[PDB]
Amino acid sequence: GSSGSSGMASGILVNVKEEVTCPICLELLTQPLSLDCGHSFCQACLTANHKKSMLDKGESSCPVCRISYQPENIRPNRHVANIVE
Numbered sequence: 001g002s003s004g005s006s007g008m009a010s011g012i013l014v015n016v017k018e019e020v021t022c023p024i025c026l027e028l029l030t031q032p033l034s035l036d037c038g039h040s041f042c043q044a045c046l047t048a049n050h051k052k053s054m055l056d057k058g059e060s061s062c063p064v065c066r067i068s069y070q071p072e073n074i075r076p077n078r079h080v081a082n083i084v085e
């Protein structure tokens with residue numbers, strides 16, 4: 001009458017602090033995206049932000065500098081479908 005093989009919950013990790021932070025959630029930016037302005041953001045925070053400025057004006061833009069560009073068809077610094085094994 002027993003079942004459940006859960007590995008040790010040692011989520012401890014020894015690494016340096018993070019410098020790249022998200023101007024939205026202000027938490028952390030490990031795999032942020034790149035825009036035509038330079039400022040990075042979360043692949044999610046960006047999607048949500050865009051909607052925000054959709055009911056007021058309609059068009060989205062950098063929530064930091066609000067530069068002129070296309071929030072669609074944007075690619076990050078590096079996009080490779082290669083996962084180390």
Ligand SMILES: [Zn+2]
Nearest residue numbers: 022025042045
């Ligand atoms: Zn974020």
Ligand SMILES: [Zn+2]
Nearest residue numbers: 037039062065
């Ligand atoms: Zn910007």
